[PDB]
């Protein structure tokens, strides 16, 4: 198995990104993270695939 | 360099006081600087040595 580095984006409409190691054979990743601009716990959904 | 203007009040706002009309009786005299200040300076050496020069 390999893991993957994905770029995850905020749904708060604030451009904010953070990268996460995620299982390759798993589903598209979605989390509750902290967005600094809105200063809140918001939903992040993975926008992009950065490193493999 | 212009001789300083006479004022009605001493010391001046910037704190400059002219020398006296007579000179004291002391057996030494300290000339004013060419800019009319008292010639006391500070000096450093080796970064830690602090001195004061009377000229």
């Amino acid at each position: 198995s390999k893991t993957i580095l994905v770029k995850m984006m905020s749904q708060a409409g604030t451009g904010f990104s953070f990268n996460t190691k995620r299982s390759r054979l798993r589903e598209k990743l979605t989390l509750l993270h902290y967005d600094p601009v809105v200063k809140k716990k918001v939903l992040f959904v993975e926008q992009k695939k950065i490193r493999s | 360099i212009p001789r300083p203007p006479k004022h009605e009040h001493y010391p001046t706002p910037s704190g400059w006081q002219p020398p006296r009309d007579p000179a004291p009786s002391l057996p030494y005299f300290v000339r004013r600087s060419r800019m009319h200040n008292i010639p006391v300076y500070r000096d450093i050496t080796h970064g830690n040595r602090q001195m004061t020069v009377i000229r």
Partner: protein
């Protein structure tokens, strides 16, 4: 370092310094931390902070940088709006 140039016979500056360092007028040099843009996902937030700092160089490095740098860069600068003008004098230093 070129100590005597060919055309002018003066002493040249090493520009590779002038891009990564900053000379305050006190003689302290200021630099970024190394690897601060590198592999951020893999690092602690604490470490990331330690990396985002601007830090001071020890005496040896400072003297080395001064030698590698001409007189012009040690001049007293007054910039409008300058962040660092606050830091260029030294205060309360008893040595």
């Amino acid at each position: 370092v070129t100590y005597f140039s060919s055309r002018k016979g003066k002493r040249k500056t090493v520009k590779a310094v002038i891009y990564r360092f900053l000379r305050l007028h006190s003689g302290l040099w200021l630099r970024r931390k190394a690897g601060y843009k590198k592999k951020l996902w893999k690092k602690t937030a604490a470490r990331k902070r330690r990396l985002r700092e601007f830090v001071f160089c020890n005496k040896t490095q400072s003297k080395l940088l001064d030698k590698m740098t001409t007189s012009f860069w040690k001049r007293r600068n007054w910039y409008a709006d300058d962040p660092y003008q606050k830091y260029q004098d030294r205060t309360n230093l008893k040595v």
